[PDB]
C-alpha cells in the first residue's frame, strides 16, 4: 500500500520460485511413485470398475485426487507474478 510498491508487481515471488519448483519436483516424483502404487493396488484389485456405473477403476480417481491435492498446494501460493506462475504451470 505504500505508493512506491502499489506501483509494482511484487518481485518477492522470484525468490521463492526455485523452492516451489523443487517442491513441484519432489511432488512429481512422489506422484509418479504414488501412480505406480495406485495402478498396482488397482491391478491387485484385478481393475474392478469403481462401480458398475462408475466404469473406470479406482486408480484414476486416486491419481486425480493426488494431482488436485498437488495443484492446490501450488494454487495456494497465488503468485502475483503470472510468468513465475506460468513457469509453475
Amino acid at each position: 500500500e505504500l505508493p512506491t510498491f502499489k506501483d509494482r508487481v511484487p518481485e518477492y515471488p522470484a525468490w521463492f520460485e526455485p523452492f516451489v519448483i523443487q517442491w513441484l519436483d519432489e511432488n512429481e516424483e512422489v506422484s509418479r511413485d504414488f501412480l505406480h502404487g495406485a495402478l498396482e493396488r488397482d491391478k491387485k484389485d484385478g481393475f474392478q470398475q469403481t462401480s458398475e456405473h462408475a466404469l473406470f477403476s479406482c486408480s484414476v480417481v486416486d491419481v486425480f485426487s493426488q494431482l488436485n491435492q498437488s495443484f492446490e498446494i501450488i494454487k495456494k501460493l497465488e503468485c502475483p507474478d503470472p510468468q513465475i506462475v506460468g513457469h509453475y504451470m
Binding site: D7, R8, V9, E11
Partner: protein, 89 residues
C-alpha cells in the same frame, strides 16, 4: 571505470509487435573498485524512456564475491511501450 559485456536482443516481439528487450549481462571487466573490504559486484540494468510507470524498470544480476571481472551470463527482458519506438529508449 570498467566495462560491461552485454549481448542485447531487441525483439519487436515476434508474439505481439510490442518491443521487448532481452539483455544478456555476460560479464563486467576492469572495474576500478579495489575496495577497502569484500567487493561484491552486481549489475543493475535499467531501461529508460517514456511510458514505463506500469513496467519493471530495473533488473539486477546476482552478486559475485571479490571479482573485478565478474561473469554473470544473466538474461533480463524489459518491455518497452508499444507506442514509442526503440529510439525513444
Amino acid at each position: 571505470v570498467g566495462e560491461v559485456s552485454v549481448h542485447v536482443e531487441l525483439f519487436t516481439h515476434p508474439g505481439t509487435g510490442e518491443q521487448k528487450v532481452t539483455v544478456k549481462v555476460v560479464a563486467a571487466n576492469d572495474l576500478k573498485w579495489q575496495t577497502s573490504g569484500i567487493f561484491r559486484p552486481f549489475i543493475e540494468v535499467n531501461i529508460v524512456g517514456p511510458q514505463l510507470s506500469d513496467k519493471k524498470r530495473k533488473f539486477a544480476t546476482k552478486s559475485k564475491n571479490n571479482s573485478w571481472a565478474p561473469k554473470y551470463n544473466e538474461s533480463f527482458q524489459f518491455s518497452l511501450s508499444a507506442d514509442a519506438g526503440p529510439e525513444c529508449y
